[PDB]
Amino acid sequence: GCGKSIDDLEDELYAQKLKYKAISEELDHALKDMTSI
Amino acid sequence: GCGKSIDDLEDELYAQKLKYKAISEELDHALKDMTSI
Amino acid sequence: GMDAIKKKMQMLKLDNYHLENEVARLKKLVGER
Amino acid sequence: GMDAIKKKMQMLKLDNYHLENEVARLKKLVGER
């Protein structure tokens, strides 16, 4: 695992989690906007 | 990343990537289902 | 699912349904008087 | 954000508005009678 493979995993982990934060923050704000439909 | 808490990393990495794809699938059908909102 | 709008839409139409039910029976009463 | 709910809720709100606007004026008018 560690040595080479994990680096690509951490690379991706960091990226995916940032995208996860972005998408969740985006959609959270999307419903947060009105919050009373 | 190495033999310490890499399990958490690998776990989360696969979990979050699935969530990412599943949430994309989610928002798509979630709003599409409610063509009558 | 997107818990926010999913549940809020339910709450939405539950409210609007009692409203449309009221206004429908109400406008009927408007025809009564 | 989320185009679907936001834009369609705009459509929604306009429907809700004509409902709540009607029922408001209606019950006020039936109440004055």
From Swiss-Prot, chains A, B:
Phosphotyrosine PTM positions: 14
Post-translational modification remark: Phosphorylated at Ser-36 by DAPK1 in response to oxidative stress and this phosphorylation enhances stress fiber formation in endothelial cells.
Entry's localization field: Cytoplasm, Cytoskeleton
Positions carrying Phosphoserine: 5, 24, 36
Function: Binds to actin filaments in muscle and non-muscle cells. Plays a central role, in association with the troponin complex, in the calcium dependent regulation of vertebrate striated muscle contraction. Smooth muscle contraction is regulated by interaction with caldesmon. In non-muscle cells is implicated in stabilizing cytoskeleton actin filaments.
Domain notes: The molecule is in a coiled coil structure that is formed by 2 polypeptide chains. The sequence exhibits a prominent seven-residues periodicity.
Family that this chain belongs to: Belongs to the tropomyosin family.
Subunit structure and binding partners: Homodimer. Heterodimer of an alpha (TPM1, TPM3 or TPM4) and a beta (TPM2) chain. Interacts with HRG (via the HRR domain); the interaction contributes to the antiangiogenic properties of the histidine/proline-rich region (HRR) of HRG. Interacts (via N-terminus) with LMOD2 (via N-terminus) and TMOD1 (via N-terminus).
Protein name: Tropomyosin alpha-1 chain
Source organism (scientific name): Rattus norvegicus
UniProtKB/Swiss-Prot annotation, chains C, D:
Observed effect of gene inactivation: Abolishes recruitment of the mediator complex to the upstream activating sequence (UAS) of amino-acid starvation responsive genes. Decreases RNA level of genes involved in amino acid biosynthesis and cofactor biosynthesis during amino acid starvation or methyl methanesulfonate stress. Growth dependent on amino acid supplementation. Sensitive to amino acid starvation. Sensitive to purine starvation. Decreases cellular glycogen levels during glucose starvation.
Family: Belongs to the bZIP family. GCN4 subfamily.
Induction statement: Translation is induced by amino acid or purine starvation, or during growth in low or poor carbon sources. Translational repression during nutrient-rich conditions is dependent on four uORFs (upstream open reading frames) present in the 5'-UTR of the mRNA; these promote ribosome dissociation. Translational induction occurs in conditions reducing translation machinery efficiency, leading to ribosomes scanning over the uORFs, and increased translation of the mRNA. The rapid translational induction is followed by transcriptional induction at later time-points, independently of the uORF sequences.
Localization of this protein: Nucleus
Subunit note: Homodimer. Each subunit binds overlapping and non-identical half-sites that flank the central CG base-pair in the pseudo-palindromic motif 5'-ATGA[CG]TCAT-3'. Interacts with the mediator tail; the interaction with GAL11/MED15 is direct. Interacts with the SAGA histone acetyltransferase complex. Interacts with the SWI/SNF chromatin remodeling complex.
Primary gene name: GCN4
Domain description: Residues 89 to 100 and 106 to 125 define the N-terminal activation domain (NTAD) and the central acidic activation domain (CAAD) respectively, which can function independently to promote high-level transcription of the target genes.
Posttranslational mods: Phosphorylated by the cyclin-CDK PCL5-PHO85.
Organism of derivation: Saccharomyces cerevisiae (strain ATCC 204508 / S288c)
Range of the intact protein held here: 264 to 281 of 281
Residues annotated as transmembrane: none
Name this protein carries in UniProt: General control transcription factor GCN4
Protein's job: Master transcriptional regulator that mediates the response to amino acid starvation. Binds variations of the DNA sequence 5'-ATGA[CG]TCAT-3' in canonical nucleosome-depleted 5'-positioned promoters, and also within coding sequences and 3' non-coding regions. During nutrient starvation (low or poor amino acid, carbon or purine sources), it activates genes required for amino acid biosynthesis and transport, autophagy, cofactor biosynthesis and transport, mitochondrial transport, and additional downstream transcription factors.
Residues in the signal sequence: none
